[PDB]
From a paper:
In this study, we show that GAS7 plays a critical role in phagocytic cup formation in macrophages. In addition to the F-BAR domain, GAS7b possess a WW domain, and GAS7cb and GAS7c possesses a WW and an SH3 domain, while GAS7d contains only the F-BAR domain. The structures of the F-BAR domains in both crystals were almost identical, with a root mean square deviation of 1.2 Å. The GAS7 F-BAR domain forms a helical-bundle dimer with a shallow concave curvature, which is one of the flattest curvatures amongst the known F-BAR domains.
GAS7b (Mus musculus and Homo sapiens), GAS7cb (Mus musculus), and GAS7c (Homo sapiens) are GAS7 splicing isoforms. To understand the functions of GAS7, we determined the crystal structure of the GAS7 F-BAR domain, using the crystals of an F-BAR fragment and GAS7cb. In the GAS7cb crystals, the periodicity observed on the monolayered membrane appeared to be absent. The zymosan phagocytosis was rescued by the endogenous-level forced expression of GAS7b and GAS7cb in the knockout cells, but not by the GAS7b ΔFFL2 mutant or the F-BAR domain fragments.
Numbering used by the authors:
A (entry chain B): 173 to 475
B (entry chain A): 172 to 474
């Protein structure tokens, strides 16, 4: 059995299968254990720190997306401001008659249009922009605490590692104290030396009692970092899936708003179309000749 | 017996028989404009046709103004499309990888597609609605002011025949005074000179009558040419106007049509986005990332 950076994997020999925790589905709690070194020589970080960077970049994407929608909204606003300003414009005003009414309704239909696109800007803000920004508001914080809570367990792993090395030398280097009492008692021997085989053999029996406790507490405070590793990577995986589905959801609402917006726009012409059917040249000629006529009597001769 | 205003003779405002309307019901230009009209004040008191021209003119004016309105719309559209295009190239949330990444990418593109649609529309507007409003009877300002002097000239040529009659009706009566006042001077001290003078200033009272004859006959003629020409070249105006109306109608109808199909093609630019959002699978992405960034594969043991 091997040991790299204070965590003991079994040795790369006759490896008993190793059943994956969560099969098929590429679990965060399965494919991240042993650490990884930065391609250079330094920056050799934890088999988890990447999960944080993924999480943080995630909440990051999220924000950039929202910023994008803001830009779209600003665009929209302006488009509406302009259609509005044009809709108030004084052009071709004095056109009288059914045709006049018709033009007028065109000039108005630009205002309707303006509204539609504006309302759309607002629903963008409401249903797409905000819920992206304000989704898990402080999250880089919850993540950076969820970080060093692991880091701390890895430190409490490394101290038990040092604790076993400076209590493994205690055994092996004081086993010279069992060997130097059968090899170096072979000179004097049999005297009041009730200490060479009795006492100094204990530094090879008290030091077994050292490595026992230190490897017990290493192995304990490892499979305590291990289990809180499993569960708080699963918590990440879950939170991630959740993020994806949230973004997907709100993007679907972006398309949805788009869709229904365009639909309400292509409808602001129906009043115009409606008035344009009622446009009758001859009726207008009436409503005008009535109002401006001069005499209906046709001249004769003399005297 | 029969009146005469501004050199044109209508029958007296008594019980004048019916007056068959030229073109009945339909308020024909050649029916309700004969007698002139005064500016509501006292001056200026203008011709009973000038208004028909002024209307034609206001017409081609309206026409222009309308084109200018559409222009503005087009400017607006051009801009909106430009901005949507700039945003479509925008780099936000780029590093989102995975099926969600592709989906987001397609959102950013749909803005370009959209932009395109709105531009294609600004164009269809310029071609099919703006231009045809400006360039409808391009020289109309020419043909109207020729059509003016054709009536106007016949009206001067009338007022002149009228003056010719009046100052030759004065001729008559003043050579009838020189008759009663020369027959009255016969009945006083009767001689030769004041007899031959009665023969003479009495033939001079028939030449003034055979003169008044022609002057009135020619008045009547050069009236019933202004009459005829009035009728038919008013009808020409009525026609032109109507033609205008339905031209404008038609092109507005097309404004709405373009509006319409524009919004329809816009509401289609989301189908790549919707289609891609359904292909969003968190677990698939977790696979494509855990594959490329995995480290540990093997899970720790004891000692």
């Amino acid at each position: 059995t091997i040991t790299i950076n204070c965590v003991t994997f079994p040795h790369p020999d006759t490896m008993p299968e190793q059943q994956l925790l969560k099969p098929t589905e590429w679990s965060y709690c399965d494919y991240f254990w042993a650490d990884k070194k930065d391609p250079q020589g330094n920056g050799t970080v934890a088999g988890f720190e990447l999960l944080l960077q993924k999480q943080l970049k995630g909440k990051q994407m999220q924000k950039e997306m929202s910023e994008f929608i803001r830009e779209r909204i600003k665009i929209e606003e302006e488009y509406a401001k302009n259609l509005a300003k044009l809709s108030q414009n004084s052009l071709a005003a004095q056109e009288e008659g059914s045709l006049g009414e018709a033009w007028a309704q065109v000039k108005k239909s630009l205002a309707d249009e303006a509204e539609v696109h504006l309302k759309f800007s607002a629903k963008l803000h409401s249903e797409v922009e905000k819920p992206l920004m304000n989704f898990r508001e402080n999250f880089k914080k919850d993540m950076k605490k969820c970080d060093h809570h692991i880091a701390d367990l890895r430190k409490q792993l490394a101290s038990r590692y040092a604790s076993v090395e400076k209590a493994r030398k205690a055994l092996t280097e004081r086993q010279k104290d069992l060997e130097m009492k059968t090899q170096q008692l072979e000179i004097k021997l049999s005297n009041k030396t009730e200490e060479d085989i009795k006492k100094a053999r204990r530094k090879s029996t008290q030091a077994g009692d050292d490595l026992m406790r230190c490897v017990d507490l290493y192995n304990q405070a490892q499979s305590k970092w291990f289990e809180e590793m499993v569960t708080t990577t699963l918590e990440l995986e879950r939170l991630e899936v959740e993020r994806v589905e949230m973004i997907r959801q709100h993007l679907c609402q972006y398309t949805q708003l788009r869709h229904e917006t365009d639909m309400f726009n292509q409808s602001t012409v129906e009043p115009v179309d409606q008035l344009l059917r009622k446009v009758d040249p001859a009726k207008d000629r009436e409503l005008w000749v009535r109002e401006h006529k001069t005499g209906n009597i046709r001249p004769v001769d003399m005297e």
